[PDB]
Amino acid sequence: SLAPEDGSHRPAAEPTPPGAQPTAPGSLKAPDTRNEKLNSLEDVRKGSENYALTTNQGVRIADDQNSLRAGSRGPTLLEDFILREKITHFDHERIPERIVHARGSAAHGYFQPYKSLSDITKADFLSDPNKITPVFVRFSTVQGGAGSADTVRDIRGFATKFYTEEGIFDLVGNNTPIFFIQDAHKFPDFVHAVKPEPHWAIPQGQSAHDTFWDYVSLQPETLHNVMWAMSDRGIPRSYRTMEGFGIHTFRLINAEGKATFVRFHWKPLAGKASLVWDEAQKLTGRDPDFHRRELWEAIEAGDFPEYELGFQLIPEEDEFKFDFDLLDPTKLIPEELVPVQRVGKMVLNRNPDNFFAENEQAAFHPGHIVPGLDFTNDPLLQGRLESYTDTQISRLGGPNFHEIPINRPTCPYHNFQRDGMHRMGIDTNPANYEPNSINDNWPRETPPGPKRGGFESYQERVEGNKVRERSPSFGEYYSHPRLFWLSQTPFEQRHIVDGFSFELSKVVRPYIRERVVDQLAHIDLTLAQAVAKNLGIELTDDQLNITPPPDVNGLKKDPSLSLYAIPDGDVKGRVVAILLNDEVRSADLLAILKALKAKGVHAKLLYSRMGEVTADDGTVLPIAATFAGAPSLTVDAVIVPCGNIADIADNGDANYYLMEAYKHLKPIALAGDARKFKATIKIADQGEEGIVEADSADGSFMDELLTLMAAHRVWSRIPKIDKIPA
Amino acid sequence: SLAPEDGSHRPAAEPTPPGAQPTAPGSLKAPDTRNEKLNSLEDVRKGSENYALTTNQGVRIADDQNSLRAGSRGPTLLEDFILREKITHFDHERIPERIVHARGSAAHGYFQPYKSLSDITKADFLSDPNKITPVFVRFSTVQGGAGSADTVRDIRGFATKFYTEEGIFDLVGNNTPIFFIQDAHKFPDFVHAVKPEPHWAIPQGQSAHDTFWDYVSLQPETLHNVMWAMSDRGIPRSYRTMEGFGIHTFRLINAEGKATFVRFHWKPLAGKASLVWDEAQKLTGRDPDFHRRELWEAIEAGDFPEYELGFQLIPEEDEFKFDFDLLDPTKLIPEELVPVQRVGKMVLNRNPDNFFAENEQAAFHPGHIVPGLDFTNDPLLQGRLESYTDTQISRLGGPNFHEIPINRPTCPYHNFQRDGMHRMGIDTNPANYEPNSINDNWPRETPPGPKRGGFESYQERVEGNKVRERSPSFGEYYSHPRLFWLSQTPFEQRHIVDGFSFELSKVVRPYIRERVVDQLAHIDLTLAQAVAKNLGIELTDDQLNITPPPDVNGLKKDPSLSLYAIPDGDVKGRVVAILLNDEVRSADLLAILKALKAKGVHAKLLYSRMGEVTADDGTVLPIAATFAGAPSLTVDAVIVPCGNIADIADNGDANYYLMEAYKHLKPIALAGDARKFKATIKIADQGEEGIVEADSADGSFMDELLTLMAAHRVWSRIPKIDKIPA
Ligand code: HEM
Ligand code: HEM
């Protein structure tokens, strides 16, 4: 039962493009990629080659194929300890999934700042451009279970654990700059509303159901983040192509004790890019693991996800100078008002070894801050501090979750805490309390100071009575949704209208749809009317007369809120499908692959069967997947080289591949006789912007294709796609 | 007063068709549907209307919108015990999912036998045709998490908890009559091989990956259940339209002590029906909850799932009379050799009230038998008995899982077991041990007997040495795979070839595909050649010459193994999409809808937007969903009535609706000018079988459509669909 003679069962331990080699554990794929945290896991990494199969007690197993029984057709015997241990371990493999963000995908990397930030913070990880901090990052959806699909419409989580020299800092953020609700007390109400309904546990991975829109209609504070969710921000192309935000205002504290308010940002260096809805929903069926897969394969290819950390900084004295409250997590701070200052770069460059041990058991918590950082009174941040430690006690089995290898600090940790389930550390200290004289009081408290000091909270002034009351300054709900709406391109606005229309059409109780349309009328009449028309609802005269909400500190728009208004495309790490035929013109393929390789764009060679095809010059071309096996949903663009086109001209799947790519606004390039396929997509002898066409695939043909790919999608095609039946 | 004045927020408590009303908890939807188990849950059912909101300690809450803070913009205070309790409960909502069969859907119902089976078993629930036993049934997939999709290719679980007067009996079966493996010792290997791969946790809900086919290629005992998984058995249209089987041979024991060997079957009274692959895969995207939904809605409609329990019975003297071992769970007993005797009927007639409390916490275990049943030495059944109690200790938090309301027997339970986490029962017995005098030895042991006796095991002779050894009688792997193959229709054989070809195409290491193909060549050369051709693999001369395995006791086919060879269609509960236009011929719609209603077939009225359209005669037609919102994947047949066809003739969604339906072999009917859509699907002027067309929807148009629906799909269309780009 052995490995093939040719070694083909084992991936090469070098970077390789997606599909070229089977995927593997990060330490076997990239053994020479290291960082302090990855090295520190070596105490628990376990190999396998050349070792005997044993029980967990170290007893060699002779027959792992059979239970012990009284005769070979007889009853199994109670004394089979080998069977019992193996089955008992299997029986207890599962642990509770995260209450939210159960579905997530993670990787290791490192961070470093561009310059010391000691003027504004004493945080050690921000103190020196040449001090590298290992990180572990998990990206996630919110609503669905661990086994739900990746490319749903949802908010995404973006959690980073920095293993710093002065402690672990977890920056536990999402991919939009606000949240749905103002006070943590409502969190279980909002999450219950979005999650599968309690009677029948439907729907998975979708906000398109009555209870969510019932809560939204009755809680207008939710409308800002609902706008972001209904836009294409809700369906990113990759975790590499979305923004990250800490949402809350936090504090930075410098050595002089000065507090500066801050909001955290991550900028994706691969650019912002999202799917369109029909593509994202069909992709949850064709590959529900698409984002997990794409992230792992990018890292194996060397297309490391990179993000720039940035800070919006507001001096203490400017706390009240905006027309929103800085502590309200449903309000964003527009970059036109407060620019994002670039802080440092994070690069994710190694996949884990074991998903369960490292991803599933990772515990992030926004209370894990370090000296130089502090909280504010944001009432959603405040309540989050009661949750993340608590939930970890059932999910991870008790209070020693920081000893699970992935969660361990790389810096020293010593205290008087003892015992708890699954206690790993064996403490030698004669004392388990302080103050003590029997160990001369060690370990000892450390005064706060400029570097290496103990944690002290900023001495913020508190004055108020003990109340359960929402601050009046939080009671405005329409101006930020409007700012967001007005900052989108026209095609982005169409996509928002379509998201609301699609979701509300799934709400069974029509009055809820009506109540939501009335809320949209308080944001923008054009948005409200367009959603209403799709729902067969007619706005009343009163609704038509609702005064729009005020501008945000005079802003009519802020283009930083759009995915696409400002070009920032990067083609490196994108993928093209190349549709083969049984006599491919090799000069086309040479030019195609050469130009793709120059820009770091991968290719997948597709055909109507697996195996190989031979090109016109005898080159044997291995086939990656069939047209049906790897649909156009999984690539950024489609190229059809010249060759024996009649081979594929009447193939339904090949035609369909182009129809689906066209519908989803992807660039398509057709060389030589492949231009015969123009007829399937109904599109003119003169040509069309978004369709590259020439006699052969040369320098020019490929430059045009790659230019289109840098703009991500062919938005100008949108009016043409409603008539195509795909 | 947030409810609408008109009361439209609340579903009517009467049966209603899918989509007509919002779905609800079973006890509110169908309060008059009762059984002894449903009544016994009354002690824990909790209402809500007219009651004050409280903490779990009973304290009325005043403000459930805010945390307590020092000033309305100030920090949250540790003393907020109301916040703390609410967030703590939320923080601990999740429990571990089942290790396998985590994705499942459940309902309540009842079973009654047709006649007393006292001559062959003393089981009380089978003793009297007027004896009604409540059941709770959970249907499931195997591989995916609780948040994975329903219409994946997989085996399905079919677990029935019978709440009998002599104890709980759990019949824990699947929808194929064999399992992949022979000995329980291999269960963690096989499950690990099918489950997502451990480095990256991909793929979800799919066996289409290297490790699964690696294990299959190395363990030919798996090939029989692999054949069933690759056939359309692996993609049922509904839980109502698949078979059930206990798989193992068990025993029935009568009052005279005679043992009869038995295998258990469930026959779906709705008939057998499956999807086709492209449809199933796309449906995991458009509605991952499709089976859960369709089951819930069938019960809300009164289309109760009904199944007939049947037994294959083999006398003890005939144990060795077959070419296969009766104790081998990779072998089926052909119904040609051993007919299924009809035993009784089960009807599922009420949904749960709360999915988590009743479905997620339900615990089934095949060791839960009752007097009149017993085990055999089947080595897979034997090892199951060590797993199911064990896994419930972590999944359900301890040894008192039988006190979770859904799992409680309805009959008396008394013993000397005490304590354990979560103990609910407060024992008053002075004694907690036996034998005791202090409570006169109560509760007391009961001798075995004809009725109401204690459990005693059948005194089977055991003779052999203590060995971990597979019986030689189990070492035959290809004859049952071949009997299955030869028993399928030609279109079912095509779908089997396509299943293997699609799955192996996703295996990244080509040598694994080649090894699987070599295994296929040991089953049937035509099968092997067809799969090899789709993989670009050429059989060797040695492969072309392998001799086929022998017939199974002289059979070269058994038609009961086919889903479709023997017509068993039932249209009640099925659904048709009706594609509206803005001036529908109202006489067509009256004819269509009343014809459907007469046969219990549901309809969904679809259009390009929500709201209403108006028919030729002013009739107002309410729209259920848009064409994109309720795709053809979700229906069994498509009817386009006459009207203003121009309204929808150039709508890409409307056209594609028909293309998709056509490709997936569904009946389509076109009335009047709707026949203009014939060009979209390339139908000839003189028409074709499976397309119903007339000048109007009158006369025999609806009878013809309904005849096509009773045969499920238009298999003769398969050669046509190849070309179509959809
Ligand atoms: C701005 C608002 C919030 C953001 C950006 C946020 C972000 C996230 C992210 C990204 C994760 C997943 C971390 C991972 O990958 O493991 C998560 C987990 C979680 N969050 Fe939040 N969250 C927010 C609000 C809240 C609130 C208000 C609460 C409760 C008061 C809460 C409770 C939790 C819990 C219980 C988990 C599961 C954590 C675990 O099991 O380890 N979240 N959150
Ligand atoms: C003929 C072969 C088998 C059949 C028909 C079968 C059927 C099933 C079904 C239908 C369920 C889901 C019950 C529900 O809906 O909750 C399940 C659960 C389970 N099965 Fe099996 N199974 C088989 C083999 C085995 C084997 C060999 C083992 C281990 C020795 C095993 C261990 C388990 C475990 C751990 C669960 C989760 C049960 C729970 O958490 O309550 N199964 N099985």
Side-chain angles (χ1 to χ4, degrees):
Chain A
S1 109
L2 12 78
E5 196 107 336
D6 63 9
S8 58
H9 52 120
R10 172 123 357 237
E14 293 273 64
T16 47
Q21 293 286 290
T23 54
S27 75
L28 308 181
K29 184 55 179 190
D32 309 320
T33 296
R34 288 178 186 287
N35 74 37
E36 187 172 9
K37 177 58 184 189
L38 288 164
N39 302 337
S40 72
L41 289 174
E42 202 56 47
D43 63 332
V44 292
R45 282 192 183 92
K46 197 131 72 285
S48 55
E49 281 185 54
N50 306 312
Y51 286 114
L53 171 65
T54 64
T55 63
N56 292 330
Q57 309 290 324
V59 167
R60 300 173 164 201
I61 290 164
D63 186 356
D64 189 49
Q65 321 303 321
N66 290 293
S67 300
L68 186 76
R69 41 178 156 269
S72 60
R73 289 187 83 246
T76 302
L77 303 190
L78 199 71
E79 76 190 74
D80 192 346
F81 72 95
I82 298 166
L83 171 65
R84 168 171 297 107
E85 182 194 83
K86 183 182 184 185
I87 295 300
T88 296
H89 203 277
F90 165 84
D91 279 347
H92 293 294
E93 286 182 10
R94 297 295 173 265
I95 70 176
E97 73 184 18
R98 297 160 170 71
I99 313 297
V100 286
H101 301 259
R103 173 69 193 184
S105 292
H108 289 269
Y110 65 96
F111 166 85
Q112 72 195 100
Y114 292 135
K115 71 177 180 153
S116 171
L117 297 189
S118 63
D119 278 340
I120 60 177
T121 177
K122 53 181 178 179
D124 183 65
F125 86 102
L126 295 170
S127 65
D128 177 346
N130 297 301
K131 271 208 307 180
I132 297 154
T133 295
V135 297
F136 187 67
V137 172
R138 182 169 179 274
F139 305 103
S140 55
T141 62
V142 179
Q143 193 262 35
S148 66
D150 282 340
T151 59
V152 290
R153 178 177 296 286
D154 205 346
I155 300 301
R156 301 312 196 275
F158 187 157
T160 300
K161 179 172 293 298
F162 292 88
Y163 297 89
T164 93
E165 316 191 347
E166 291 191 3
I168 283 176
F169 164 41
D170 289 336
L171 202 188
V172 188
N174 284 348
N175 77 329
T176 68
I178 67 295
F179 199 60
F180 300 99
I181 61 170
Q182 291 186 335
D183 190 306
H185 198 79
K186 313 275 326 150
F187 194 76
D189 294 306
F190 170 75
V191 167
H192 281 184
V194 76
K195 285 266 182 173
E197 301 193 7
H199 55 302
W200 61 347
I202 291 181
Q204 200 68 212
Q206 297 164 62
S207 49
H209 63 106
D210 294 44
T211 60
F212 175 72
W213 289 106
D214 191 37
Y215 186 89
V216 169
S217 73
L218 296 176
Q219 298 282 277
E221 76 200 55
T222 67
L223 285 164
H224 189 192
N225 210 202
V226 165
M227 302 284 300
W228 282 73
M230 292 308 108
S231 85
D232 290 349
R233 295 273 180 166
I235 43 179
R237 160 64 180 82
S238 169
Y239 296 136
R240 310 184 291 104
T241 63
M242 63 186 203
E243 294 183 307
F245 299 96
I247 293 172
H248 314 289
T249 304
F250 289 85
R251 284 174 171 114
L252 299 187
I253 307 303
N254 73 16
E256 277 43 58
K258 195 180 72 171
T260 296
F261 295 115
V262 60
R263 287 204 183 184
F264 301 120
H265 286 248
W266 286 119
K267 165 184 284 185
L269 303 180
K272 297 173 275 167
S274 285
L275 306 180
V276 302
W277 169 243
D278 183 51
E279 178 198 10
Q281 186 194 40
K282 215 196 294 194
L283 188 50
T284 65
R286 301 304 197 190
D287 183 9
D289 301 303
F290 182 69
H291 284 156
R292 185 170 285 176
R293 186 187 320 273
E294 197 256 6
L295 174 65
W296 189 282
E297 290 178 338
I299 288 175
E300 295 204 341
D303 301 321
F304 302 140
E306 298 172 291
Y307 305 84
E308 182 170 88
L309 188 54
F311 290 169
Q312 291 176 294
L313 298 169
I314 303 190
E316 185 164 62
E317 70 266 17
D318 288 353
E319 173 172 8
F320 294 99
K321 280 168 181 181
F322 302 85
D323 61 29
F324 52 96
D325 195 312
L326 281 184
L327 300 190
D328 176 354
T330 67
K331 295 295 183 298
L332 55 77
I333 303 174
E335 296 180 46
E336 282 297 316
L337 303 189
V338 182
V340 169
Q341 175 189 148
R342 73 192 235 115
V343 168
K345 180 159 71 160
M346 175 168 65
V347 176
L348 299 183
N349 69 348
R350 225 199 70 187
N351 284 314
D353 283 309
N354 184 263
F355 181 104
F356 180 89
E358 293 167 84
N359 176 328
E360 187 66 24
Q361 294 193 129
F364 297 84
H365 179 77
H368 293 162
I369 57 164
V370 292
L373 311 183
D374 214 336
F375 304 119
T376 60
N377 296 333
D378 171 324
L380 193 64
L381 173 57
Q382 287 270 314
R384 281 174 79 201
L385 306 176
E386 214 357 72
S387 173
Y388 292 70
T389 302
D390 175 49
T391 196
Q392 294 159 5
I393 262 60
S394 57
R395 185 170 67 93
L396 301 181
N400 291 312
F401 60 85
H402 61 284
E403 304 188 308
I404 300 178
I406 192 65
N407 300 320
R408 303 181 303 201
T410 55
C411 65
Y413 107 79
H414 297 85
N415 58 42
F416 293 101
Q417 297 183 37
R418 294 292 181 265
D419 300 0
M421 191 72 76
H422 210 114
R423 184 60 179 187
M424 298 290 298
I426 296 179
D427 287 283
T428 62
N429 194 335
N432 60 175
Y433 61 94
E434 71 84 9
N436 69 75
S437 66
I438 69 167
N439 197 48
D440 202 7
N441 215 24
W442 292 109
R444 289 186 186 171
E445 293 153 292
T446 307
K451 279 158 228 96
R452 296 285 180 292
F455 188 93
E456 186 178 89
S457 291
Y458 177 66
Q459 296 180 33
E460 181 170 26
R461 185 72 185 165
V462 175
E463 291 180 17
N465 292 81
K466 292 190 175 174
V467 289
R468 286 174 174 90
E469 190 183 330
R470 203 72 59 82
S471 179
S473 61
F474 279 41
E476 193 289 310
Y477 305 126
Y478 305 121
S479 70
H480 292 227
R482 171 166 186 88
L483 176 56
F484 176 81
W485 166 264
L486 284 177
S487 301
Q488 304 314 115
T489 67
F491 53 94
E492 282 176 309
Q493 291 184 333
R494 173 197 290 262
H495 291 173
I496 290 164
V497 165
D498 292 349
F500 279 105
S501 303
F502 177 91
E503 298 239 338
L504 294 172
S505 89
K506 302 311 190 84
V507 168
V508 170
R509 298 169 176 82
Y511 75 89
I512 290 169
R513 312 182 198 148
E514 299 169 347
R515 284 172 185 194
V516 176
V517 168
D518 191 62
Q519 290 290 355
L520 300 186
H522 289 80
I523 293 166
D524 183 85
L525 269 0
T526 295
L527 163 64
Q529 289 183 106
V531 171
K533 193 207 217 328
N534 283 335
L535 293 179
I537 292 166
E538 230 220 314
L539 303 192
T540 61
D541 283 351
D542 290 347
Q543 293 172 313
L544 295 156
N545 287 320
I546 297 161
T547 302
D551 294 324
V552 177
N553 293 95
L555 291 175
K556 296 234 174 270
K557 74 177 79 194
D558 187 330
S560 62
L561 298 183
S562 166
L563 291 170
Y564 301 119
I566 310 278
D568 71 341
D570 175 352
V571 302
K572 185 175 190 272
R574 299 291 193 111
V575 51
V576 171
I578 289 176
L579 306 195
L580 295 181
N581 63 77
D582 62 10
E583 192 70 352
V584 172
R585 180 161 67 187
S586 68
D588 280 345
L589 199 61
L590 257 62
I592 290 166
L593 300 182
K594 177 175 197 265
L596 287 186
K597 179 197 187 173
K599 284 284 168 66
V601 176
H602 304 305
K604 80 174 58 168
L605 304 183
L606 303 188
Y607 193 53
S608 53
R609 63 158 169 84
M610 300 290 295
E612 302 160 330
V613 287
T614 298
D616 58 4
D617 72 341
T619 296
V620 174
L621 302 180
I623 294 148
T626 61
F627 306 133
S632 76
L633 309 172
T634 70
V635 305
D636 291 291
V638 184
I639 304 164
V640 192
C642 185
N644 187 27
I645 299 299
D647 182 24
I648 58 167
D650 307 308
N651 175 306
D653 291 346
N655 281 284
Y656 189 77
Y657 207 99
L658 301 177
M659 288 170 82
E660 187 189 66
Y662 187 81
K663 180 182 173 183
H664 296 152
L665 310 183
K666 302 164 176 176
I668 287 169
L670 304 170
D673 289 359
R675 284 176 294 189
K676 292 278 202 154
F677 280 112
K678 283 170 65 172
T680 323
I681 41 158
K682 243 152 212 34
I683 215 94
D685 325 64
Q686 292 308 115
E688 185 164 271
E689 269 179 77
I691 306 293
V692 182
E693 60 174 294
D695 290 347
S696 71
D698 47 16
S700 188
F701 175 96
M702 288 309 296
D703 293 333
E704 289 168 52
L705 195 249
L706 285 150
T707 295
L708 292 170
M709 282 188 79
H712 179 53
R713 292 295 171 88
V714 182
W715 314 117
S716 59
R717 188 189 295 165
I718 286 165
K720 288 154 224 243
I721 78 169
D722 279 9
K723 314 145 98 324
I724 47 68
Chain B
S1 285
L2 305 196
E5 202 104 16
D6 65 6
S8 64
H9 57 299
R10 170 86 42 190
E14 66 186 44
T16 49
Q21 308 263 171
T23 56
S27 76
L28 302 178
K29 179 67 181 174
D32 298 339
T33 294
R34 303 307 303 162
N35 76 39
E36 179 189 7
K37 176 64 186 184
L38 288 172
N39 292 345
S40 77
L41 292 173
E42 204 55 41
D43 67 331
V44 299
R45 266 195 197 92
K46 210 183 304 82
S48 52
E49 290 161 56
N50 310 315
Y51 290 117
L53 180 56
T54 67
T55 64
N56 291 331
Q57 306 291 324
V59 174
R60 292 179 171 207
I61 293 165
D63 182 354
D64 192 49
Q65 321 306 322
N66 291 293
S67 305
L68 185 69
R69 39 180 153 269
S72 59
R73 261 180 110 250
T76 299
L77 304 187
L78 201 54
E79 71 197 81
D80 193 339
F81 63 102
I82 302 166
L83 169 73
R84 178 170 293 105
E85 183 194 75
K86 187 182 178 181
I87 295 305
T88 291
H89 203 277
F90 169 80
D91 280 345
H92 296 287
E93 281 184 10
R94 301 289 176 264
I95 75 178
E97 70 183 23
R98 295 163 173 71
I99 312 305
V100 282
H101 298 259
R103 174 73 191 183
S105 304
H108 292 275
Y110 68 96
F111 165 83
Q112 191 168 357
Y114 298 135
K115 71 173 176 186
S116 174
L117 298 187
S118 286
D119 286 7
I120 58 171
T121 176
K122 54 179 180 184
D124 185 64
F125 80 105
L126 292 170
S127 65
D128 175 348
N130 303 307
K131 188 176 294 245
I132 301 280
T133 298
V135 293
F136 186 66
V137 168
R138 179 167 184 279
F139 298 108
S140 54
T141 57
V142 176
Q143 188 259 41
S148 65
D150 285 331
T151 65
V152 292
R153 180 177 303 279
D154 203 353
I155 305 296
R156 301 311 197 278
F158 187 149
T160 302
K161 181 168 296 294
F162 291 89
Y163 297 92
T164 95
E165 294 181 12
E166 298 192 0
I168 288 300
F169 165 43
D170 289 337
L171 184 42
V172 183
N174 287 340
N175 73 334
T176 68
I178 71 292
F179 196 60
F180 296 98
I181 61 166
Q182 297 182 336
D183 186 311
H185 195 78
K186 297 300 291 175
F187 196 69
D189 297 304
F190 173 76
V191 178
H192 283 186
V194 75
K195 285 264 185 180
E197 305 190 7
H199 55 302
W200 58 353
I202 288 181
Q204 195 71 214
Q206 296 163 71
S207 58
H209 60 105
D210 289 53
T211 62
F212 172 78
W213 291 100
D214 194 39
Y215 183 93
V216 166
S217 77
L218 297 166
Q219 296 282 271
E221 69 204 55
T222 63
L223 292 163
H224 191 194
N225 215 201
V226 168
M227 296 286 306
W228 285 74
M230 293 310 108
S231 71
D232 285 349
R233 300 269 187 166
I235 43 176
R237 155 64 177 78
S238 178
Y239 297 138
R240 308 185 292 108
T241 61
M242 68 188 194
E243 284 185 316
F245 302 93
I247 296 168
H248 314 291
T249 306
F250 292 76
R251 293 175 158 115
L252 295 186
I253 311 293
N254 70 12
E256 285 99 312
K258 185 172 71 160
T260 300
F261 294 112
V262 60
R263 288 199 179 184
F264 301 114
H265 287 249
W266 289 118
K267 174 173 157 178
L269 299 188
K272 297 174 280 177
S274 279
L275 305 179
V276 302
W277 173 241
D278 178 58
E279 178 196 10
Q281 193 191 33
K282 204 161 152 184
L283 186 50
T284 63
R286 302 298 198 197
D287 178 14
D289 301 303
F290 180 76
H291 287 156
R292 186 172 281 177
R293 188 187 311 278
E294 193 256 12
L295 175 65
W296 195 278
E297 295 183 334
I299 287 163
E300 290 207 347
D303 301 326
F304 300 141
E306 301 182 309
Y307 301 86
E308 181 165 88
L309 184 57
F311 285 167
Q312 288 178 297
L313 276 340
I314 296 182
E316 202 179 50
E317 321 82 82
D318 291 6
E319 181 167 4
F320 296 107
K321 289 191 189 168
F322 306 85
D323 282 349
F324 54 91
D325 197 314
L326 296 179
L327 304 179
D328 179 351
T330 65
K331 296 299 179 297
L332 53 81
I333 305 175
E335 286 177 55
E336 280 296 308
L337 304 186
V338 184
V340 176
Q341 290 178 41
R342 303 184 337 140
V343 159
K345 185 166 76 157
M346 181 168 63
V347 179
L348 303 180
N349 66 353
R350 228 202 65 193
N351 293 314
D353 285 305
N354 181 262
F355 185 104
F356 178 89
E358 296 167 83
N359 172 327
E360 189 63 33
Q361 297 188 130
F364 301 80
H365 182 74
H368 296 163
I369 57 166
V370 293
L373 307 179
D374 215 330
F375 302 121
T376 59
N377 295 334
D378 175 321
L380 185 63
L381 170 61
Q382 294 271 310
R384 290 182 73 197
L385 305 177
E386 179 63 40
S387 171
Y388 289 71
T389 304
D390 179 46
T391 194
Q392 291 149 16
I393 299 310
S394 60
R395 181 172 75 88
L396 299 175
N400 290 308
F401 59 79
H402 65 284
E403 310 185 305
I404 299 172
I406 192 67
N407 293 327
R408 303 181 308 197
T410 49
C411 58
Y413 112 78
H414 295 89
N415 57 44
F416 299 97
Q417 301 179 31
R418 298 285 182 268
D419 305 357
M421 193 66 81
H422 310 296
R423 178 66 183 189
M424 295 294 297
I426 297 178
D427 288 286
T428 62
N429 194 336
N432 64 174
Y433 57 94
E434 69 82 9
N436 65 75
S437 65
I438 68 165
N439 199 42
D440 207 6
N441 208 25
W442 293 104
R444 284 189 192 169
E445 290 153 297
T446 306
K451 295 204 184 63
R452 294 287 189 283
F455 188 89
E456 180 175 274
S457 288
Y458 175 73
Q459 286 183 52
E460 174 167 35
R461 167 143 203 271
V462 180
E463 197 197 292
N465 284 330
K466 295 186 179 183
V467 290
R468 286 179 174 82
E469 181 181 345
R470 204 69 66 76
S471 181
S473 65
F474 282 45
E476 194 287 314
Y477 306 126
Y478 302 121
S479 74
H480 284 47
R482 183 183 176 67
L483 174 70
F484 181 82
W485 169 259
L486 290 172
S487 288
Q488 295 322 288
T489 65
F491 50 94
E492 290 176 301
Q493 286 177 345
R494 174 83 254 201
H495 290 170
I496 286 163
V497 161
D498 294 347
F500 278 105
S501 303
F502 176 82
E503 294 243 341
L504 298 165
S505 90
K506 302 293 178 101
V507 169
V508 170
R509 288 165 184 91
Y511 79 87
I512 292 173
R513 312 177 193 159
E514 294 168 4
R515 283 174 184 194
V516 179
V517 164
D518 185 65
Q519 294 293 173
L520 299 190
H522 289 80
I523 299 171
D524 179 86
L525 251 272
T526 299
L527 182 225
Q529 284 183 125
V531 170
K533 180 199 196 319
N534 287 335
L535 300 174
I537 288 169
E538 227 194 307
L539 300 190
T540 69
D541 293 326
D542 281 34
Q543 290 168 320
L544 296 171
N545 279 330
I546 292 150
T547 129
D551 304 344
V552 178
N553 284 93
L555 264 11
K556 297 165 261 59
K557 63 169 82 188
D558 188 325
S560 63
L561 302 185
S562 175
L563 291 167
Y564 300 118
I566 308 294
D568 69 353
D570 176 350
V571 95
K572 185 169 178 298
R574 289 304 181 105
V575 60
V576 174
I578 294 172
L579 314 191
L580 298 180
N581 60 78
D582 69 351
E583 207 178 350
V584 168
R585 207 212 299 215
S586 56
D588 274 352
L589 229 226
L590 284 176
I592 291 159
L593 299 172
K594 198 176 183 189
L596 290 188
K597 184 168 183 310
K599 297 302 177 289
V601 177
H602 298 116
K604 61 176 90 165
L605 306 181
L606 309 180
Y607 195 48
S608 47
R609 63 154 170 84
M610 298 292 281
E612 295 162 341
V613 291
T614 293
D616 62 359
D617 79 346
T619 302
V620 179
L621 279 359
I623 297 157
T626 55
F627 304 127
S632 73
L633 311 172
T634 66
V635 300
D636 295 285
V638 184
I639 300 183
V640 188
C642 177
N644 182 203
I645 301 299
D647 182 36
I648 58 147
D650 299 321
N651 177 309
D653 291 352
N655 288 288
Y656 189 73
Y657 207 100
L658 299 179
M659 296 175 81
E660 187 185 65
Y662 189 70
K663 180 180 182 188
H664 292 151
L665 317 179
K666 288 171 180 168
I668 291 163
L670 301 180
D673 299 343
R675 301 169 280 192
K676 282 177 173 88
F677 282 114
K678 286 171 86 178
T680 283
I681 34 171
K682 314 261 190 208
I683 315 304
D685 279 5
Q686 118 252 320
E688 74 179 38
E689 276 145 339
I691 301 298
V692 179
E693 50 187 285
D695 290 342
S696 74
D698 90 342
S700 69
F701 179 87
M702 288 311 294
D703 291 344
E704 285 156 24
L705 188 266
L706 290 160
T707 296
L708 291 181
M709 291 186 71
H712 182 54
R713 298 290 170 89
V714 186
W715 313 112
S716 59
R717 187 187 298 167
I718 290 167
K720 295 116 193 292
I721 71 165
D722 262 9
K723 88 190 165 305
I724 98 162

